Motif scaffolding. Structure first.
Motif, mmCIF file in Angstrom:
data_model
loop_
_atom_site.group_PDB
_atom_site.id
_atom_site.type_symbol
_atom_site.label_atom_id
_atom_site.label_comp_id
_atom_site.label_asym_id
_atom_site.label_seq_id
_atom_site.Cartn_x
_atom_site.Cartn_y
_atom_site.Cartn_z
ATOM 1 N N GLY A 1 0.855 -1.167 0.000
ATOM 2 C CA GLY A 1 0.000 0.000 0.000
ATOM 3 C C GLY A 1 0.893 1.219 0.000
ATOM 4 N N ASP A 2 2.194 0.961 0.090
ATOM 5 C CA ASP A 2 3.204 2.004 0.175
ATOM 6 C C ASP A 2 3.556 2.477 -1.227
ATOM 7 O OD1 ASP A 2 3.130 1.079 2.819
ATOM 8 O OD2 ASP A 2 4.872 -0.216 2.496
ATOM 9 N N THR A 3 3.394 3.772 -1.477
ATOM 10 C CA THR A 3 3.831 4.365 -2.736
ATOM 11 C C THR A 3 5.325 4.637 -2.640
ATOM 12 O OG1 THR A 3 1.649 5.361 -3.019
ATOM 13 C CG2 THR A 3 3.438 6.195 -4.387
ATOM 14 N N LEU A 4 6.127 3.820 -3.327
ATOM 15 C CA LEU A 4 7.577 3.953 -3.235
ATOM 16 C C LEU A 4 8.040 5.313 -3.742
ATOM 17 C CD1 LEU A 4 9.022 0.451 -4.119
ATOM 18 C CD2 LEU A 4 8.024 1.344 -2.015
ATOM 19 N N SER A 5 7.524 5.741 -4.892
ATOM 20 C CA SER A 5 7.875 7.037 -5.455
ATOM 21 C C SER A 5 6.841 7.420 -6.503
ATOM 22 C CB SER A 5 9.275 7.032 -6.085
ATOM 23 O OG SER A 5 10.207 6.295 -5.314
ATOM 24 N N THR A 6 6.754 8.721 -6.766
ATOM 25 C CA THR A 6 6.015 9.253 -7.905
ATOM 26 C C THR A 6 6.989 10.069 -8.741
ATOM 27 O OG1 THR A 6 5.285 11.456 -7.220
ATOM 28 C CG2 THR A 6 4.211 9.563 -6.204
ATOM 29 N N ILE A 7 7.146 9.690 -10.005
ATOM 30 C CA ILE A 7 8.163 10.262 -10.876
ATOM 31 C C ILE A 7 7.482 10.869 -12.091
ATOM 32 C CG2 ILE A 7 10.255 9.829 -12.191
ATOM 33 C CD1 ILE A 7 9.746 7.053 -10.080
ATOM 34 N N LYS A 8 7.796 12.129 -12.372
ATOM 35 C CA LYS A 8 7.380 12.745 -13.619
ATOM 36 C C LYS A 8 8.377 12.406 -14.718
ATOM 37 C CE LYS A 8 5.307 16.981 -15.341
ATOM 38 N NZ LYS A 8 5.650 18.345 -15.829
ATOM 39 N N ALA A 9 7.898 12.415 -15.957
ATOM 40 C CA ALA A 9 8.738 12.039 -17.085
ATOM 41 C C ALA A 9 9.763 13.131 -17.361
ATOM 42 C CB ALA A 9 7.881 11.784 -18.319
ATOM 43 N N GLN A 10 11.041 12.766 -17.326
ATOM 44 C CA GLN A 10 12.120 13.692 -17.629
ATOM 45 C C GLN A 10 12.322 13.759 -19.141
ATOM 46 O OE1 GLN A 10 13.828 11.210 -14.940
ATOM 47 N NE2 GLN A 10 12.323 12.218 -13.618
ATOM 48 N N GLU A 11 13.405 14.405 -19.577
ATOM 49 C CA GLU A 11 13.640 14.570 -21.007
ATOM 50 C C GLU A 11 13.895 13.237 -21.699
ATOM 51 O OE1 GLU A 11 14.279 17.772 -23.324
ATOM 52 O OE2 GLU A 11 12.442 17.677 -22.129
ATOM 53 N N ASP B 1 15.117 12.292 -10.064
ATOM 54 C CA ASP B 1 15.247 13.737 -9.935
ATOM 55 C C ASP B 1 14.863 14.421 -11.246
ATOM 56 O OD1 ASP B 1 18.896 14.272 -10.189
ATOM 57 O OD2 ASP B 1 17.428 13.687 -11.692
ATOM 58 N N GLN B 2 15.060 15.738 -11.309
ATOM 59 C CA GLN B 2 14.637 16.513 -12.468
ATOM 60 C C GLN B 2 15.627 16.455 -13.622
ATOM 61 O OE1 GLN B 2 12.855 20.465 -11.493
ATOM 62 N NE2 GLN B 2 13.727 21.123 -13.452
ATOM 63 N N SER C 1 17.744 13.728 -14.277
ATOM 64 C CA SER C 1 18.110 12.341 -14.570
ATOM 65 C C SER C 1 19.494 11.995 -14.028
ATOM 66 C CB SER C 1 18.030 12.057 -16.070
ATOM 67 O OG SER C 1 16.860 12.623 -16.632
ATOM 68 N N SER C 2 19.807 12.500 -12.837
ATOM 69 C CA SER C 2 21.092 12.253 -12.201
ATOM 70 C C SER C 2 20.995 11.343 -10.987
ATOM 71 C CB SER C 2 21.741 13.581 -11.795
ATOM 72 O OG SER C 2 22.963 13.362 -11.115
ATOM 73 N N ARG C 3 19.793 10.924 -10.598
ATOM 74 C CA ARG C 3 19.598 10.105 -9.411
ATOM 75 C C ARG C 3 18.749 8.890 -9.753
ATOM 76 N NH1 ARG C 3 19.468 8.568 -4.350
ATOM 77 N NH2 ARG C 3 20.116 9.936 -2.635
ATOM 78 N N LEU C 4 19.115 7.745 -9.188
ATOM 79 C CA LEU C 4 18.379 6.508 -9.398
ATOM 80 C C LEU C 4 17.369 6.294 -8.277
ATOM 81 C CD1 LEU C 4 21.423 4.220 -10.318
ATOM 82 C CD2 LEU C 4 20.099 5.708 -11.830
ATOM 83 N N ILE C 5 16.288 5.593 -8.601
ATOM 84 C CA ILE C 5 15.204 5.351 -7.651
ATOM 85 C C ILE C 5 15.660 4.343 -6.603
ATOM 86 C CG2 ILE C 5 12.724 5.032 -7.482
ATOM 87 C CD1 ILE C 5 12.700 4.977 -10.580
ATOM 88 N N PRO C 6 15.682 4.703 -5.325
ATOM 89 C CA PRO C 6 16.066 3.751 -4.283
ATOM 90 C C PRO C 6 14.862 3.068 -3.649
ATOM 91 C CG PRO C 6 16.077 5.961 -3.383
ATOM 92 C CD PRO C 6 15.504 6.061 -4.783
ATOM 93 N N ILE C 7 15.130 1.916 -3.032
ATOM 94 C CA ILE C 7 14.137 1.219 -2.230
ATOM 95 C C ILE C 7 14.779 0.790 -0.917
ATOM 96 C CG2 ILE C 7 12.790 0.424 -4.212
ATOM 97 C CD1 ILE C 7 14.034 -2.268 -3.970
ATOM 98 N N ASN C 8 13.925 0.545 0.073
ATOM 99 C CA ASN C 8 14.370 0.236 1.421
ATOM 100 C C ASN C 8 14.924 -1.188 1.483
ATOM 101 O OD1 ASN C 8 14.844 0.394 4.138
ATOM 102 N ND2 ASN C 8 12.735 0.884 4.720
ATOM 103 N N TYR C 9 15.307 -1.609 2.690
ATOM 104 C CA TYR C 9 15.757 -2.979 2.905
ATOM 105 C C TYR C 9 14.582 -3.923 3.122
ATOM 106 C CZ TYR C 9 18.390 -6.907 4.838
ATOM 107 O OH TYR C 9 18.930 -8.150 5.076
ATOM 108 N N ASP C 10 13.598 -3.508 3.923
ATOM 109 C CA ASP C 10 12.394 -4.314 4.087
ATOM 110 C C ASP C 10 11.604 -4.384 2.786
ATOM 111 O OD1 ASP C 10 12.297 -4.698 7.260
ATOM 112 O OD2 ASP C 10 12.845 -2.615 6.846
#
Ligand SMILES: [Ca+2]
Ligand SMILES: [Ca+2]
Lengths: 154, 96, 51
Positions: A1-11, A38-39, A41-50
């Motif tokens: 039920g956890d939204t990991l991230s919301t990402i808008k489309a970059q270039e 990020d805005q 495209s310099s950062r990758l989407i992370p996720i937790n350990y659990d």
């Protein structure tokens, strides 16, 4: 039920053209990757350990499209089509507020249309009143043969 | 009359007494209009935005403004001002 | 930090503020972009008595 991230489309993940019934990337091409948060495209989407422990145990990540942006084209003072500064988000709410949505499946080829509906509590609303049959005939371009509607042959 | 101080499209006397919008023109209100679904509007005759919202008196009365704003906002004395809030649903903590 | 954990307090002082005011454009729409207050702060302070 956890939204990991919301990402808008970059270039990197912006579709220049999307015709009705088309697809980006076009049919016959691999899907485009979405691995930047990020805005610029310099950062990758992370996720937790659990969350990773959940992921490696078989659970699936679902994707939900909350909203979509984009432009439309019109003619300037010259004969040149300009599609900069024109947006659909200005007309989305106005179209949704005075229209009835109609869908049609027809063997994995979906059509979604909006038809103007007249307000009967407003004496100054002059939009013509249509039945459901007339709306269906107008929206999908179906033809009439013997008082019934056929889409192409169905 | 024909006076117009606020320089909207509605005469001052109509604003003082009462008016309704039909055929995109403001006309004097008669009590026989209520059975047809019409409404009676009265507003300031020295102002162009009686309620303070960006749309003027004629735009609000005639409904010429955006079509996604409610009907109650169409009278000049009610402001079409949205109230947006934010509600948290759950919190996730990622230990570092 | 050693001063801070020994009881001393940090004081906050506002040296200046910035912000815009509202005015009417050619239409009836209020515009508050580019209408700064720092242009008039000194002129108001130079000819006025504070109460
Ligand atoms: Ca007036
Ligand atoms: Ca007025």
């Amino acid at each position: 039920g956890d939204t990991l991230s919301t990402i808008k489309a970059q270039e990197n993940q912006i579709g220049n053209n999307l015709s009705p019934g088309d697809t980006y990337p076009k049919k016959g091409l691999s899907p485009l990757a979405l691995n930047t948060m990020d805005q610029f495209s310099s950062r990758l989407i992370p996720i937790n350990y659990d969350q990773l422990k959940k992921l490696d145990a078989g659970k699936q990540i679902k994707l939900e499209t909350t909203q979509v942006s984009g432009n439309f084209g019109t003619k300037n003072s010259s004969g040149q089509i300009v599609t900069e500064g024109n947006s659909w988000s200005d007309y989305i709410s106005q179209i949704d507020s005075i229209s009835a949505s109609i869908i049609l499946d027809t063997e994995n080829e979906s059509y979604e249309r909006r038809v103007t509906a007249k307000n009967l509590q407003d004496p100054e609303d002059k939009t013509p009143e249509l039945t459901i049959g007339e709306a269906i005939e107008k929206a999908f371009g179906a033809t009439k043969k013997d008082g019934l509607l056929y889409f192409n042959d169905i | 009359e024909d006076l117009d101080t606020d320089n909207d499209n509605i005469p001052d006397s109509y604003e003082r007494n009462g008016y309704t919008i039909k055929d995109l023109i403001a006309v004097k209100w008669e009590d026989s209009f209520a059975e047809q679904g019409y409404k009676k509007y009265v507003s300031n005759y020295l102002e162009s935005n009686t309620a303070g919202d960006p749309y003027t008196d004629y735009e609000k009365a005639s409904g010429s403004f955006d079509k996604a704003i409610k009907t109650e906002a169409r009278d000049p004395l009610v402001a079409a001002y949205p109230i947006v809030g934010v509600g948290m649903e759950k919190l996730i903590i990622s230990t570092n």
